[PDB]
Amino acid sequence: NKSRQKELTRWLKQQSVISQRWLNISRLLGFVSGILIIAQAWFMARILQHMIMENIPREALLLPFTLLVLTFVLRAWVVWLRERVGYHAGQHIRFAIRRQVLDRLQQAGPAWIQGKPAGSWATLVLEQIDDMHDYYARYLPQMALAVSVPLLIVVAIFPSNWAAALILLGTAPLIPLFMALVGMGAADANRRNFLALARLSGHFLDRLRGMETLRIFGRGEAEIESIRSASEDFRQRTMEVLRLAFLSSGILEFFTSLSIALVAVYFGFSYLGELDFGHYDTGVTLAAGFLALILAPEFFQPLRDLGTFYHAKAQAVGAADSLKTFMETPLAHPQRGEAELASTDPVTIEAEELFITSPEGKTLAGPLNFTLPAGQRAVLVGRSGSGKSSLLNALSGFLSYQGSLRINGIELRDLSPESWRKHLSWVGQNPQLPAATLRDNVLLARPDASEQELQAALDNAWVSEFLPLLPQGVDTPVGDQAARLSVGQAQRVAVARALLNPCSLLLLDEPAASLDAHSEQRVMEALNAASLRQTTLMVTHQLEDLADWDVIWVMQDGRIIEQGRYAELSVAGGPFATLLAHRQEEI
Template sequence: MASVNSSSPAAPVGSPSSASPTPAQWLRVNAARSGHWPRVAILAAALSTLLLLVQAWAIATIAQRMVIDAADFSTLLVPLLVLPCAFIARGLCARLKTLAGTRAGILVRQSIRAELLQRLGERGPLWARRQHSATLGNRIWDQVDALHGYYADYRPQMMLCALIPLIILVAVFPLNWAAGLILLITGPMIPLNMAMIGWGAKSLQEAQFREMNRLGRHFLDTVRGLPTLKLFGIGRAQAASVERISEDFRRRTMKVLRLAFLSSTALEFFASVSIALLAIYIGFSYLGHFSFGTWDHGLSLFIGLFILVLAPEYYQPLRDLGTHYHAKAEAEAAAEDLIPLLARDAVDGEIPPARGWRPPERLGLRLHQVVARYPGQLRPALDGLDLELRPGETLAVIGPSGAGKTTLLNVLLGFLPIESGSLASDAGEPLADLAREEWQRGLGWVGQRPALIKGNLADNLRLAANGEVDDAALWRALEQAQLKPWARALPRGLDTAIGEGGQPVSGGQARRIALARAFLRDAPLTLLDEPTASLDVESEELVIDALDRLRRGRTLVMLTHRLELLRLADRILVLENGRATACADFATLSAPGGPLAYLAQPRGLQHV
């Protein structure tokens, strides 16, 4: 679990890195996630280049024999048959290269997105609540997707920029060293231009991501606050604000696109000039003005045409790299935001590895002088708390707002590391020695707002199960939570979709689904946060009956202010300003002079 003592705060499994990598380093390291697909893409492109040599030979041979040699048609059969075969084979290679690159990008995105979601889970709900959901959504989806072009296109193209020109130079230099020298000298002009444009593209892409985050946050806040905006009659003004921000985002997008088009135009210009230089040399050689570079065997039509067919393909990998260079800038801008989220040292401290700990059938806790503080807060939320929770005991926790009740649950759940003190099981085993996942397998949870995932009723129940469970176990849990009649009446029973887009679920029914999960999980320690809050009388009675069954044989810690639940508790812990002011049974605390004495009066409240 998350460490719950001062020496070992919460962290994901694995040692933290000593220093954050640069975006370029991070992108290179994560290339291993793409498997063998980049090599397949490179091999397909290399094979296509070799087929290009065959294609150029066939074209040059046909022209030489028809125009210069005036050869018989029978001598053209071989190149005429080879030429369409080379065309078709090159098309298949291009298809394979595209598919392999796409598959590489998909694998990297899936892997990084899965790790990102794991990291968010390791940080826990306390960290997530401090983040804007639109920003997190943008990073999980848009910024991870921004990595695709880098791994699918840019990285394989980097290798091809060296491999393909080298193959062509090896073919050209033995025929004409001057043509090879022209290719060799003019080639670097394209990546040099590409690099200069790329410097500006990265800064524009970073600004674009920031603006996208801002637009997402603004739009989500507007949607969430729409009822309030309409109530106060400022919906139109807010619509104008959204329009203004959207227009600003459009202008920024057009700046990025203009730069991309400028890059492509510049690359085409330099490639065209380079090919023109080569064509001028060959043309003037045919006119007799140039007599160098031929290795003393002259410049035939075959040689000149062969070189001219290869020349565009010599520059094509460099042009493609320039076209994909914006993908590198986009990926590096996305990596700037993803690195802090994925870094193992981003989650406070370090946790021990899993060591096979299994929850006992009955579990108690011992807290000694526990101090817990939220990040950025001066005053501790728990200040020197001492508590011994006996196995099988039901403990109710009460206190005014800000007393530390929710903080106590966060500490027990492993989401908030403690600053000092100690927390151990009743057997004396420090929880700091346990991995977070191991500890949480021994916990059940019932919150005020139970989360219903998209799926059917069975999916929502199995969410909490420790291992595989059959339908019979699901029906038993529903029966214990007083939900079996409702589930029987559903159109498809356990297979009925519930929640958004499915069968509507009331607040009381959602609370009892959470209780059914707790029965199904059968954890030795169950934590509950206001299990009857905001329920009608009938739903509250059903929940209380279910809680009475749940507490048998289990240790329960529940935050509540309801009198009926206080009477279920073996002891009641009273918190104030993070300190325990009293801890005893209901009879003792409600006796004259006790903190709950007013409840014993004839007009005692039902809500503490």
């Protein structure tokens, strides 16, 4: 879709304003480098004429040598200078875009971040954003040097001969003509082969992730003839594309070769006298044919490098396709109020017609009506997809609701999220330890806490049970997504920090859901004794032991449908009893 391609490259060229004095110096230095090329080719052409025509000894030519050596030094300086300026252009764009991405991703909060795998956000922040470096560092600076340097060459050859300058300039319209003429036969070979080369692209990794399936079926020897056949197909199918993409590259090497060969013949023949045009009747000199011959390869070098950096435009329009889509998502955030709750005691939460809605606008929990007084341990049960966790997120301020959810008599949306989250602590379904070391994770809530309270905090959560089992003790590294702590060990440390600070509410997504048998006993009784200190709301899948809790709040498809003490609805014959039967049907 070239309608969006106009908007994508407009996005790419809009994000470049951050480093705009770097893309201006890189354009100025591409003009200077085109002037040091002409001076370099003018001093060699004049030195070579003196030695060859006038037979001037090299010791008399110390002034043109000094200038010639000087241009080579300045020519190398503005190549070193231009490489560095180009990096700064692309760095300050990647840095500023990545900050925007990590701000829209932090304001969106945990409700939206879970929409995608955690490695599918690190593709967007690491790979996609860094894929845009070479479009600003190398492609954009080169497209400036690809129009200035060739035009400086012609403007500097035209005073000497207009036929030498016409050879180089005559190929200026011919190259795009044939390159597009070929390039539109390479969009038919790249169209009928696009689907078949996307299927064959990932065929190896597909057969490589299903080796256990091929082992148990005895097809391991019959997939070598599939890799053999899907590689002959891939090769023969991509050589058709390449057979035309190397003609486009070869159009420029044809006119580079033709122009160097025409300058040589035109000048060589005009010195002899076979040709009598091109000059201004002043005669053609040897230094005017050397100048047009040193500058004939240099006329096409900017257009040749640009053909190598052109791929950087494709992988930067690819990364702009997903960065523009991400940055223009219309998702709406919960309102951060200014009201503050200074009760510092169990809150009297209660709600009416919440209609909790995801960031994308979809509704998650239907009409919700409940009144949980201060200090009352309350539980939620149900089946998957009923939005039991969507109510816990909505109480943490991660979700937006259309109705009244008044905490201690104050509307939640009007309550400032910063102050609301010191009276709140919770245990997640999946323990996430954002710190590095185990001691820091417990002290994540309180940056610096009294050691006796710390000691009492982690002893009470039964994390000291396996502290001797750890290599370095408390101050041990809990590596990211690594099994330094198993699911059992890493769940009691989540509870350890949940109970470290007093809270006016305590949510529990599903502590001890995927836990091991022994840890489940250890983690669950510590929370169970901790749900008697402040108003607690818990979501559980083990319906077997809930007699102590105050209510049940079983809900299905977004609405609380039964409420009451576990004794009441244990055998009432309702869906909770049916749901309880489902739990016992497995083991």
